[PDB]
Write an enzyme that holds these catalytic residues in place. Structure first.
Site, PDB file in Angstrom:
ATOM      1  N   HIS A 202    -134.313 -16.036  17.868  1.00  0.00           N
ATOM      2  CA  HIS A 202    -133.508 -15.943  16.665  1.00  0.00           C
ATOM      3  C   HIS A 202    -134.435 -15.494  15.536  1.00  0.00           C
ATOM      4  O   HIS A 202    -133.999 -15.423  14.394  1.00  0.00           O
ATOM      5  CB  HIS A 202    -132.925 -17.306  16.211  1.00  0.00           C
TER       6      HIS A 202
ATOM      7  N   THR B 261    -123.631 -15.447  12.008  1.00  0.00           N
ATOM      8  CA  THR B 261    -122.551 -16.148  12.628  1.00  0.00           C
ATOM      9  C   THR B 261    -121.635 -16.504  11.485  1.00  0.00           C
ATOM     10  O   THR B 261    -120.453 -16.184  11.584  1.00  0.00           O
ATOM     11  CB  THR B 261    -123.357 -17.196  13.279  1.00  0.00           C
TER      12      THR B 261
ATOM     13  N   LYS C 104    -124.384 -19.876   2.310  1.00  0.00           N
ATOM     14  CA  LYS C 104    -125.615 -19.376   2.944  1.00  0.00           C
ATOM     15  C   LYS C 104    -126.727 -20.392   2.696  1.00  0.00           C
ATOM     16  O   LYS C 104    -126.667 -21.016   1.624  1.00  0.00           O
ATOM     17  CB  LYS C 104    -126.027 -18.000   2.330  1.00  0.00           C
ATOM     18  N   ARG C 105    -127.688 -20.654   3.601  1.00  0.00           N
ATOM     19  CA  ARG C 105    -128.766 -21.592   3.275  1.00  0.00           C
ATOM     20  C   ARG C 105    -129.362 -21.263   1.896  1.00  0.00           C
ATOM     21  O   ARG C 105    -129.510 -20.042   1.686  1.00  0.00           O
ATOM     22  CB  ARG C 105    -129.775 -21.451   4.371  1.00  0.00           C
TER      23      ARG C 105
ATOM     24  N   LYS D  82    -117.090 -15.352  10.997  1.00  0.00           N
ATOM     25  CA  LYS D  82    -116.110 -16.341  10.590  1.00  0.00           C
ATOM     26  C   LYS D  82    -115.349 -15.867   9.399  1.00  0.00           C
ATOM     27  O   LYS D  82    -114.144 -16.070   9.455  1.00  0.00           O
ATOM     28  CB  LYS D  82    -116.691 -17.696  10.177  1.00  0.00           C
TER      29      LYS D  82
ATOM     30  N   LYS E 230    -132.114 -15.304   0.889  1.00  0.00           N
ATOM     31  CA  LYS E 230    -130.711 -15.329   1.240  1.00  0.00           C
ATOM     32  C   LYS E 230    -129.982 -14.683   0.071  1.00  0.00           C
ATOM     33  O   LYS E 230    -129.016 -13.961   0.304  1.00  0.00           O
ATOM     34  CB  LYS E 230    -130.295 -16.776   1.529  1.00  0.00           C
TER      35      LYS E 230
HETATM   36  C1  LIG Z   1    -121.337 -20.878  11.038  1.00  0.00           C
HETATM   37  C2  LIG Z   1    -122.157 -21.886  10.356  1.00  0.00           C
HETATM   38  C3  LIG Z   1    -123.497 -21.647   9.995  1.00  0.00           C
HETATM   39  C4  LIG Z   1    -124.156 -20.313  10.152  1.00  0.00           C
HETATM   40  O1  LIG Z   1    -124.513 -19.705   8.842  1.00  0.00           O
HETATM   41  P1  LIG Z   1    -124.857 -18.149   8.693  1.00  0.00           P
HETATM   42  O2  LIG Z   1    -124.892 -17.487  10.023  1.00  0.00           O
HETATM   43  O3  LIG Z   1    -123.889 -17.504   7.781  1.00  0.00           O
HETATM   44  O4  LIG Z   1    -126.354 -17.939   7.935  1.00  0.00           O
HETATM   45  P2  LIG Z   1    -127.591 -19.100   7.884  1.00  0.00           P
HETATM   46  O5  LIG Z   1    -127.115 -20.149   6.922  1.00  0.00           O
HETATM   47  O6  LIG Z   1    -128.761 -18.381   7.331  1.00  0.00           O
HETATM   48  O7  LIG Z   1    -127.812 -19.505   9.298  1.00  0.00           O
HETATM   49  C5  LIG Z   1    -124.207 -22.633   9.371  1.00  0.00           C
HETATM   50  N1  LIG Z   1    -123.596 -23.803   9.045  1.00  0.00           N
HETATM   51  C6  LIG Z   1    -122.290 -24.019   9.389  1.00  0.00           C
HETATM   52  C7  LIG Z   1    -121.658 -25.285   9.015  1.00  0.00           C
HETATM   53  C8  LIG Z   1    -121.563 -23.068  10.019  1.00  0.00           C
HETATM   54  O8  LIG Z   1    -120.271 -23.312  10.356  1.00  0.00           O
END
Ligand SMILES: *Cc1c(COP(=O)(O)OP(=O)(O)O)cnc(C)c1O
Ligand SMILES: O=c1[nH]cnc2c1ncn2[C@@H]1O[C@H](COP(=O)(O)O)[C@@H](O)[C@H]1O
Ligand SMILES: O=c1[nH]cnc2c1ncn2[C@@H]1O[C@H](COP(=O)(O)O)[C@@H](O)[C@H]1O
Ligand SMILES: *Cc1c(COP(=O)(O)OP(=O)(O)O)cnc(C)c1O
Lengths: 823, 823
Positions: A363, A662, A554-555, A666, A560
């Site tokens: 990843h 991911t 986003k985190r 969604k 980001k």
């Molecule tokens: C789908 C998901 C995720 C995944 O987040 P992202 O792929 O948009 O980006 P990162 O935050 O950088 O990984 C994270 N948390 C939850 C709750 C969720 O449903």
């Protein structure tokens, strides 16, 4: 004996037998009465009433695999992000209608009850959610599959915003119990730490090891209506409790009460550098899982089917370990220790088995992110495991020299051991060495795993490099969270899409018709309303149902790019205030995530986003044209609320940084339009949705490399751009922070003088892509017309597919959409 | 709401609904199945099929209590010796017969399954077992009672003889759960320790205190077939787990990992001197029960029934608190604390209520045994409570002055403060002052408290001292353990005896009917056959089911005299081997007890019993005319296995040592003759049986007091009696000890030069009584007839009698043997 059977115990879809068994668990499993129950009680009551349904099937599924002896595949990961299981158990088990009717009759409102559930705290982000999703699709597709991880009592933190500052509260999601796990104290296994390897006669011996106990807990995972339910099995650390008199370590000194607690807190906290706890954790979940995996191989009728040593020959025909990221990697020197030292297979029979049995998903894109442990840390708590890491290594490098004779600098580039000050072990070249296949998570990202990051390994074994694009589960991310959108779609096409998602393209045939087109902006009007009330009833503000719901969840990391997005909203705020009268398409902008405790840039940014808002949202001129909102403690069950009520999904990460997205998939499937850079996920989504249909923007990868090759001089942009110039100026004057003007000082200098990620570059393009947006919202017929096309096009983004391919190219199993007879 | 009712959940004595329920629990509850199940797993399914029926009744009984508002009585003990809940829960609820049928069809053996339950490690001795007997009796006579203690996770040790030496192993009885409790997190309360008392304005305030948390666990207690099932609520200590980040004690240092271990183990082990642990287990159970008690007062419709303070004026009329011995004593400065400081009653109103609420049961005789805590302990962990103990002490001593004007040596002997090196507080005198009734546990013992031990309190307040002789429950201790004996007895007089034990006098009518005379012996022949089979199949020896099962199952201490009965076994040896063919009525002597870690005499006494048997039982002359057995790890489940099987019940303490003797009473009921001194319980058991039916012996008390008045010179007895000389000289020569001969030398010197309990003195008369014993045995009609007059005279020893007198004479309520309609 045979009279003890699964046979009479269900009248499943039946509002009257489900009212009988709700009463049964509230007075007899909970030992409460209606005279003293609480919502929490009645939710517990109900969780056991849908659970005996699930474990009715569970026993059958499982029996089925032991008499049908498939290959069993273990998905190993350190984070599983499940979140609320009640609605998902019911909708996959068919039961939601009966349960609603039953609890209704009983005068209980099932929605108020589903909101007493704590989000299962064993995840923290992407990686977790991802395994969460593959467990659904695996079982829906009938694979003999398991998820294997640590059970975390305290999740990871629960975000509180106090003062416009992030404070982390602890998540003890388990404080009152978890209705879905079943503990197993009879399958407790020992896990060994530290010690010494004494080499004696026909092996090595690892002696004087401290020990921590791995105690299991099974949560089941239900397929989509096919009555296969499989096992997620998390481990818990329990100290030996001899520590009293027994051993005669103690008596004299209980200071070993530290053995006690340091142990127990292997399982206590998720992580959140080279810590002896992280490596202690990683070894924990691998060492127990591997004794369990080996035990079903000796049991699962292969006790009978020995033909050889109960062979390990067949071990790769019977078992598949998926390493998720590099946190599982000792699965490889641990299977090599169990096989070699404990059983007795020679090193090469042993290594045949290992490679043929593992595989590793990656990843990461930046090499400053591949796990790496100190050899002195692995010598201390794992000493046998370092000798085996060394002998794997010797042998791998002898393969390398027999392929590129005379390359010397490659022997030092591919090694497992890395030299500098602090000689370390590279956890990922351990995994490529000990896996039969590696896969990325994005086409772009596995090409750059082949072309740059692992390219010498791609030369030595090209055939290990595969790619397997990430996905979302149709179920959770459309049927549970988005049920109108799953109703109207279904009307026009059928059910089958929810277990074969690409069928969504039949909705392309509806692109102009004014039915879908009003329906869709109807549901979508629904969703935004509800949530525009949640924004008042739990947390509070004054949204405007009509607006652009503009969300990035986003985190909160620098790369980001929240801060890009805070300039843009400072941009809009300015315009409207100079031009108090321009018709400007309004927006409610919603940023959401958790920083990282002690990352002060991330703590400064959530500070930004509150402080903006307190300005904008309390300034008259702006009225209700412009609202900024920070979504506190964004998480999986806030995901499933927000992602339906969104129009604009803000994907702005610097290009090249994202390996995927991911969270991205969604918002496509729930008709949100995607602004964003041409990276990670955004690429395959644009490929399907048609570039015209997507607000792609800014610096491509190329352009960034070029700006680095000539050097990024931040100030230039600040001096072309008159807006920017002024917003930086308003930040450093204390416009947005009057009590401490100086408050955003660091942020300033972050941007102006040493931005690693080129926010000020992508500004000018960003605020013009955003101009395209405001302009197209206010043309709802076409705005909604695109959405229908993004939705239609979503089917490569379903986890069922992602699994089908790990299934077909890597694991060696055909899926199956069959319904297992059962209940 | 109302539709959520206890109503439709039970087809009871229905072999088809019990099998249905087994099966829900094996599969749904346990999430196991018949391919994977173990006997432990099936006992937990039986455990649970039964529990549904229990808790059913418990729901209807507690409701009942809240709608009729009886006086609730709370029994405060630190020890509840429950032992095994399942055969006992089926008999009270009539289900024994149907579960046998039901499990038999499923093709599982209900006796197999019963033997897997762990003896609830909640006690240690006769103090625990009484509290349990009382609990079965308080429920069988419709008493609105609650029993309250601590939940000990490890019990107290498990015993293990290794080369005949005691080794204590731990009792993690709670290891695969316990299926009868229900953990209640929702009802956790804090308990406060240490701190400092701020004296502010209208009150003092106890401030800066450490906090341990008490979490409750409920175990339901069944009456005998009257459908009232009452509560035992045992407390677990838990540390507040903010210890990681929250408080800012931690971070900088986690050496307060100790608060956590030193909080966690208030609940860890039973004990087993002036230890902080003990006084911290004492306050904790007190602290946490007086809040749950003042909560039911304030809650149980007495909120409604306020009229004044929710007056605690009515508090005696609705609560009653039984401090079983001094360990609950702090319930008197803590009830006063809550009421004066927390509520705001004045001192004198609050004392009216504390005295009318509390009552003390004492079980001691020697004054060396009365609890005492140094004021530096109290001053430190309990500084508010020391204070109150001082006001209480001042004020009682001012009552004393008015009664005996100018008696000063009384003022100092009646004090609660004791003066010597170390100023102690006397917890016994605390109890007599804040209680409204003190009591003994056998009539002689009540009387010495009144004439010697508390006699100046007898003098200032003669109205307080009562007596309530101990008593055993006919259910466990006869119906449950010896059902044969219950059956022949039932044929002749019916069931009412089980709930009305005086009614066993009717059995006198048949002393001379020869069916009974033969059914009784028959009965017993079975019991001993059974037992004898255990003694080869769970432990090994070669019994001869025909000999006289001679048994002593007492606490291994020096005044409990097993060295006396050691000597006597070696005499019987010495005789079978001087004269190898004379006829000797043969015995199988069984002595069992658990030492007490740290008592060295006790520990060598079992090394003695274990080696006497090594010789006697392998010496081929003896053949099978003797055998000696040390019963391993005596607990309630071996008691219901040995106590049926025996003939002579060895009751030999030195006269003046025993206050009572629950042990004894179980033997009379199961048809065993009692040989033993005229002390304690032996007194009234002799009086209802008549002397003639008992083998009383030895020095009566008036004689021990004489031999002390002149000085017991052991040597004289060793120099008259030749067989004594002989065994002493066997002990020192190394007869029993051939590898370290010198081994029993400290036993030999004890005996010779400083026995405080005059063994040699009773030796001569003792072995004489054993000759009258063997003698009569060897005449089965008349031995069986003396057996039948012990069983018929059993009645005074029913804990339903002891309870009815507490209720009427102390607690102020009326027994009712009425069936609550229910289920
Ligand atoms: C789908 C998901 C995720 C995944 O987040 P992202 O792929 O948009 O980006 P990162 O935050 O950088 O990984 C994270 N948390 C939850 C709750 C969720 O449903
Ligand atoms: O040998 C077997 N035959 C049939 N079912 C089995 C057997 N072993 C286990 N099971 C089932 O498989 C489940 C999982 O077993 P495990 O793989 O040992 O954890 C159990 O709950 C049973 O339903
Ligand atoms: O006010 C009440 N009315 C009826 N039943 C009650 C009430 N309060 C408690 N109960 C019942 O009493 C049980 C025990 O509560 P406790 O005695 O308060 O510990 C509850 O589980 C209910 O069955
Ligand atoms: C009844 C009982 C006891 C109590 O033993 P005793 O009453 O004989 O007297 P002490 O030894 O003086 O306490 C102890 N243990 C069990 C199992 C039991 O049933």
């Amino acid at each position: 004996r045979k009279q003890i059977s699964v046979r009479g115990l269900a009248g499943v879809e039946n509002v009257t037998e489900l009212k009988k068994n709700f009463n049964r668990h509230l007075h007899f499993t909970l030992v409460k009465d209606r005279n003293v129950a609480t919502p929490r009680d009645y939710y517990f009551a109900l969780a056991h009433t849908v659970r005996d349904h699930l474990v009715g099937r569970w026993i059958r599924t499982q029996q089925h695999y032991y008499e049908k002896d498939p290959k069993r595949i273990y998905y190993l990961s350190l984070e599983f992000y499940m979140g609320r299981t009640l609605q998902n158990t019911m909708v996959n088990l068919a039961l939601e209608n009966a349960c609603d009717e039953a609890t209704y009759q009983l005068g209980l409102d099932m929605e108020e009850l589903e909101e007493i559930e704590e989000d299962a705290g064993l995840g923290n982000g992407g990686l977790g959610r991802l395994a969460a999703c593959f467990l659904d699709s695996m079982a829906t597709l009938g694979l003999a599959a398991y998820g294997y991880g640590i059970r975390y009592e305290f999740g990871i933190f629960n975000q509180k915003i106090c003062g416009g500052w992030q404070m982390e509260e602890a998540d003890d999601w388990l404080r009152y119990g978890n209705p879905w796990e079943k503990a197993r104290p009879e399958f407790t296994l020992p896990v060994h730490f530290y010690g010494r390897v004494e080499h004696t006669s026909q092996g090595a011996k690892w002696v004087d090891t401290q020990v921590v106990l791995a105690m299991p807990y099974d949560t089941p995972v239900p397929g989509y209506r096919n009555n296969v339910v499989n096992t997620m099995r998390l481990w818990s650390a329990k100290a030996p409790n001899d520590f009293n008199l027994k051993d005669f370590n103690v008596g004299g000194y209980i200071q070993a009460v530290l053995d006690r607690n340091l142990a127990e807190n292997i399982s206590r906290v998720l992580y959140p550098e080279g810590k002896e706890l992280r490596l202690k954790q990683e070894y924990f979940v691998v060492a127990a899982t591997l004794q369990d995996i080996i035990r079903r191989f000796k049991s699962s009728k292969f006790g009978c089917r020995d033909p050889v040593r109960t062979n390990f020959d067949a071990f790769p025909d019977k078992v598949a370990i998926q390493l998720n990221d590099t946190h599982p990697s000792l699965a490889i020197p641990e299977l090599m220790r169990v096989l070699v030292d404990l059983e007795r297979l020679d090193w090469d029979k042993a290594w045949e088995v290992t490679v043929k049995t593992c595989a590793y998903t990656n990843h990461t894109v930046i090499p400053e992110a591949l796990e790496r442990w100190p050899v002195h840390l692995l010598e201390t708590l794992l000493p046998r495991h370092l000798q085996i890491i060394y002998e794997i290594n010797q042998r791998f490098l002898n393969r390398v020299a027999a392929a590129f004779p005379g390359d010397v600098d490659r022997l030092r580039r591919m090694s497992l051991v890395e030299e500098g000050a602090v000689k370390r072990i590279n956890m990922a070249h351990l995994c490529i060495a000990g896996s039969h296949a590696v896969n990325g998570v994005a086409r772009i990202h596995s090409e750059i795993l082949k072309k740059t990051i692992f390219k010498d390994f791609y030369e030595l074994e090209p055939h290990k490099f595969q790619n397997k694009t990430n996905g979302i589960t149709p179920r959770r991310w459309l049927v549970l969270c988005n049920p109108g959108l799953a109703e109207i779609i279904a009307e026009r096409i059928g059910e089958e899409y929810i277990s074969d998602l690409d069928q969504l393209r039949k909705l392309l045939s509806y692109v102009d018709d004014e039915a879908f087109i009003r329906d869709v902006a109807k549901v979508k009007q629904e969703n935004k309303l509800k949530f525009a009330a949640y924004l008042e009833r739990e947390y509070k503000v004054h949204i405007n149902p009509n607006s652009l719901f503009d969300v990035q969840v986003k985190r909160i990391h620098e790369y980001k790019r929240q801060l890009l997005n805070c300039l843009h909203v400072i941009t809009l705020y300015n315009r409207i205030k100079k031009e108090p009268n321009k018709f400007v398409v309004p927006r409610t902008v919603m940023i959401g995530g958790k920083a990282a405790p002690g990352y002060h840039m991330a703590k400064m940014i959530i500070k930004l986003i509150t402080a903006i808002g307190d300005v904008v949202n309390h300034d008259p001129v702006v009225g209700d044209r412009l609202r900024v909102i920070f979504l506190e403690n964004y998480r999986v069950s806030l995901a499933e609320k927000v992602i339906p009520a969104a129009d604009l999904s803000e994907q702005i990460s610097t290009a090249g940084t994202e390996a995927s997205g991911t969270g991205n998939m969604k918002f496509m499937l729930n008709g949100a339009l995607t602004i964003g850079t041409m990276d990670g996920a955004n690429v395959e989504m644009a490929e399907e949705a048609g570039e015209e249909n997507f607000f792609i923007f800014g610096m491509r990868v190329e352009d960034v490399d070029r700006l680095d090759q000539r050097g990024y001089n931040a100030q230039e942009y600040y001096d072309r751009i008159p807006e920017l110039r002024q917003i930086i100026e308003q930040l450093s004057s204390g416009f947005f922070s009057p009590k401490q003007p100086d408050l955003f000082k660091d942020i300033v200098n972050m941007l102006m003088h040493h931005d690693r990620f080129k926010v000020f570059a992508d500004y000018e393009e960003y605020v013009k892509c955003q101009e395209r947006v405001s302009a197209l919202y206010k043309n709802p017929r076409e705005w909604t017309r695109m959405v229908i096309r993004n939705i239609a096009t979503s089917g490569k983004f379903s986890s069922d597919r992602t699994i089908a391919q790990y299934a077909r190219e890597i694991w060696g199993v055909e899926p199956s959409r069959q319904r297992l007879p059962a209940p």
